[PDB]
Amino acid sequence: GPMEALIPVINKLQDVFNTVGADIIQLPQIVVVGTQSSGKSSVLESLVGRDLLPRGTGIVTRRPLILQLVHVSQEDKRVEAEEWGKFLHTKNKLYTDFDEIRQEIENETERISGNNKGVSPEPIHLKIFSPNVVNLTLVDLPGMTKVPVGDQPKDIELQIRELILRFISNPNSIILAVTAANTDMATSEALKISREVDPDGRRTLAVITKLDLMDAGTDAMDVLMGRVIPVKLGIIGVVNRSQLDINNKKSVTDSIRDEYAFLQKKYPSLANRNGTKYLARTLNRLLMHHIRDCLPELKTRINVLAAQYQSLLNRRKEAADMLKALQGASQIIAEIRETHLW
Amino acid sequence: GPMEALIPVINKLQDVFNTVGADIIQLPQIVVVGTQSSGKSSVLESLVGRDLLPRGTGIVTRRPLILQLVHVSQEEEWGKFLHTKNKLYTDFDEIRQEIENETERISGNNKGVSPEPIHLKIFSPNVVNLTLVDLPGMTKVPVGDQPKDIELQIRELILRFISNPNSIILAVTAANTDMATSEALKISREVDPDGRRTLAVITKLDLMDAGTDAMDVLMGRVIPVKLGIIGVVNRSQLDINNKKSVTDSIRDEYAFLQKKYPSLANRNGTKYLARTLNRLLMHHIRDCLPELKTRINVLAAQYQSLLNSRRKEAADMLKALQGASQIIAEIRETHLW
Ligand SMILES: Nc1nc2c(ncn2[C@@H]2O[C@H](COP(=O)(O)OP(N)(=O)O)[C@@H](O)[C@H]2O)c(=O)[nH]1
Ligand SMILES: Nc1nc2c(ncn2[C@@H]2O[C@H](COP(=O)(O)OP(N)(=O)O)[C@@H](O)[C@H]2O)c(=O)[nH]1
Ligand SMILES: [Ca+2]
Numbered sequence: 001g002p003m004e005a006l007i008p009v010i011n012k013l014q015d016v017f018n019t020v021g022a023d024i025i026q027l028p029q030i031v032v033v034g035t036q037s038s039g040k041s042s043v044l045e046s047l048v049g050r051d052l053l054p055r056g057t058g059i060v061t062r063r064p065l066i067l068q069l070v071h072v073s074q075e076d077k078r079v080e081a082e083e084w085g086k087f088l089h090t091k092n093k094l095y096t097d098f099d100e101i102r103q104e105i106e107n108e109t110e111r112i113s114g115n116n117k118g119v120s121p122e123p124i125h126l127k128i129f130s131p132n133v134v135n136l137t138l139v140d141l142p143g144m145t146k147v148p149v150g151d152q153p154k155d156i157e158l159q160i161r162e163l164i165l166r167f168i169s170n171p172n173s174i175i176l177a178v179t180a181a182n183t184d185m186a187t188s189e190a191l192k193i194s195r196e197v198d199p200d201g202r203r204t205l206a207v208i209t210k211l212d213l214m215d216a217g218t219d220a221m222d223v224l225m226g227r228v229i230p231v232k233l234g235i236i237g238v239v240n241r242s243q244l245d246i247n248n249k250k251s252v253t254d255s256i257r258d259e260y261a262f263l264q265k266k267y268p269s270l271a272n273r274n275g276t277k278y279l280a281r282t283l284n285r286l287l288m289h290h291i292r293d294c295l296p297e298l299k300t301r302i303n304v305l306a307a308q309y310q311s312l313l314n315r316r317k318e319a320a321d322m323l324k325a326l327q328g329a330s331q332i333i334a335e336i337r338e339t340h341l342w
Numbered sequence: 343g344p345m346e347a348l349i350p351v352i353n354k355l356q357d358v359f360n361t362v363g364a365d366i367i368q369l370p371q372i373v374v375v376g377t378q379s380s381g382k383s384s385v386l387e388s389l390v391g392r393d394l395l396p397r398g399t400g401i402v403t404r405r406p407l408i409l410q411l412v413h414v415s416q417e418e419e420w421g422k423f424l425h426t427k428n429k430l431y432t433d434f435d436e437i438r439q440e441i442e443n444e445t446e447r448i449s450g451n452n453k454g455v456s457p458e459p460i461h462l463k464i465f466s467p468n469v470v471n472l473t474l475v476d477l478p479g480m481t482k483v484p485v486g487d488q489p490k491d492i493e494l495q496i497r498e499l500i501l502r503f504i505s506n507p508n509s510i511i512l513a514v515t516a517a518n519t520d521m522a523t524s525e526a527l528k529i530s531r532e533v534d535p536d537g538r539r540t541l542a543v544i545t546k547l548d549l550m551d552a553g554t555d556a557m558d559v560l561m562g563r564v565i566p567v568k569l570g571i572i573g574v575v576n577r578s579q580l581d582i583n584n585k586k587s588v589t590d591s592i593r594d595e596y597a598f599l600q601k602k603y604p605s606l607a608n609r610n611g612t613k614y615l616a617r618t619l620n621r622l623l624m625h626h627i628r629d630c631l632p633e634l635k636t637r638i639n640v641l642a643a644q645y646q647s648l649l650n651s652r653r654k655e656a657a658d659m660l661k662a663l664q665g666a667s668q669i670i671a672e673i674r675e676t677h678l679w
């Protein structure tokens with residue numbers, strides 16, 4: 001997938017965490033928000049690079065999906081041969097086929113939310129284990145709506161908006177504020193709600209989907225150049241698979257190639273600052289910023305243990321081994337701080 | 343234009359009001375509502391069949407436009423703005439440009455929105471007495487000059503118009519958005535909860551993602567709308583830039599519906615929207631008739647008892663009352679296309 005760049009950094013972090021006995025730095029959760037059917041689940045899944053999320057026409061995401069990417073060491077290892085999933089609700093059952101994972105999200109949605117468009121705030125908890133992912137939580141959410149349909153109650157719009165607010169009010173989260181290109185940016189429910197929890201725009205990244213669907217005679221040039229609504233962290237256009245493409249089993253590889261071709265053709269001056277890879281790179285930078293901000297905490301925590309193991313040295317092999325391990329940890333911190341992603 | 347069918351009906355209704363010496367009822371205002379850029383102004387002007395409304399991307403309609411169609415008696419077409427008083431406009435591109443100018447004068451040149459209406463009269467032999475109201479579309483995030491509470495200002499401006507019980511609401515939703523996300527239908531249901539005066543229009547059918555269509559929406563399988571859900575295809579921004587005519591737009595709309603919605607094509611498109619609206623307007627007309635009827639009876643006995651074995655005027659104005667009752671019956675019996 002497009003978010004492998006941080007793997008060597010988080011491997012070094014894991015070395016430190018193993019010594020310190022605590023996973024002290026937690027990456028922000030990445031939470032996708034926007035109007036129903038704006039292309040949200042497609043964006044989130046593009047960060048995985050594997051097809052595992054129900055996507056489609058009408059209301060689709062009907063429970064929060066807390067999707068925990070879990071990096072797997074070479075020791076705990078087993079391409080479809082190396083990756084697997086576990087759901088909390090299916091206890092210890094292992095999933096190898098990502099199509100079956102997708103179906104189970106749908107299964108578990110139907111069980112709690114019903115089969116006539118109902119929505120539930122109860123999250124589905126999913127872990128995806130892989131040697132090729134970082135430790136990162138992605139959150140898929142129901143999209144904002146206006147008029148109740150199916151089983152939905154009269155106050156469904158507010159139920160959904162309050163549910164979104166609970167996830168993005170988390171200070172340690174990054175909001176992917178999704179708006180479809182075939183709507184006016186000023187009508188963006190994603191940017192409105194993001195500004196309520198993040199008024200200064202320190203953790204909101206604007207994603208513009210469906211660039212391919214814009215009316216003839218129009219384009220998103222002004223939008224993508226920040227000439228409509230400025231958004232500090234970035235405004236990034238993407239092109240994901242159409243419903244036709246989904247129906248035709250179009251691959252992720254072909255989706256990305258066509259997105260590249262599309263941007264080269266219609267937005268040549270802006271192409272290198274747009275697309276799915278650029279969204280990933282932008283996100284990596286935000287995640288690395290969080291890591292760097294937290295290094296002093298980590299360093300201090302090493303010193304706490306270093307002084308403590310040095311003390312009962314003043315269980316003796318235990319102490320000498322740990323001090324060396326903690327000296328190793330201290331060197332690692334400096335290496336991480338000084339890492340810059342290509 | 344697409345809405346001439348009521349001309350003969352309002353003409354004979356006028357005769358009845360003339361005869362009874364009463365003021366003719368006003369037809370309800372037709373008010374277009376929806377999210378910014380959903381296709382509202384294109385829908386509203388399609389009921390006129392002349393290009394007089396500014397249309398485009400970004401925020402365009404930034405003042406209400408109260409477009410009063412005025413039927414011209416024998417005893418072509420032109421416009422009059424209240425603010426210019428006397429000047430008459432025969433050039434409809436010049437009318438359009440004046441709407442833009444007036445909008446900039448009061449709302450400024452940086453995306454600001456004003457509740458002050460533009461009053462425009464369009465005089466024609468080929469129109470009925472009818473008021474069409476164009477409104478700024480709903481929004482979420484302030485841009486340019488707009489204050490923090492712009493969304494609420496626009497929404498309450500809309501409510502000011504559609505809260506009028508003598509209004510028909512054209513609830514406009516773009517086909518390239520999920521119907522359940524319709525801000526037009528949400529707001530319409532607030533002022534018209536039983537759907538007695540809300541007509542749903544689905545624009546931009548041609549812009550739907552490949553592998554999708556509005557079949558479920560148009561058959562009432564998503565949100566039911568009592569009075570109807572009617573799909574239309576108006577001119578793209580490319581078509582506007584290229585000055586594509588109304589005639590060509592309608593032809594291509596018809597063709598698109600035949601090709602993509604053959605089973606529903608007869609109950610969709612701009613012509614069907616106009617016919618559906620005429621039928622709604624006819625409903626209002628029939629509801630004024632009992633009032634008119636009782637007034638004819640009062641004047642009838644008032645003229646009849648006035649007798650002496652002047653003495654021929656009361657004789658022929660009794661016959662003009664008899665004529666008026668039969669015209670009322672005719673209106674009730676009239677079928678519309
Ligand atoms: N043409 C096009 N279609 C898209 C794009 N992104 C999503 N879609 C389509 O839009 C629909 C909604 O996609 P989804 O990811 O489920 O969005 P949601 N409902 O906001 O979770 C799907 O039919 C999908 O194929 C895009 O960039 N271009
Ligand atoms: N392709 C297509 N474009 C449309 C349609 N209706 C409106 N548009 C385009 O959408 C934009 C907004 O149209 P307009 O009538 O001004 O809508 P508004 N802003 O809601 O008053 C314009 O660029 C117009 O060309 C449609 O049915 N199909
Ligand atoms: Ca080392």
Ligand SMILES: [Mg+2]
Nearest residue numbers: 040041060061
């Ligand atoms: Mg979704």
Ligand SMILES: [Mg+2]
Nearest residue numbers: 382383402403
């Ligand atoms: Mg308009």
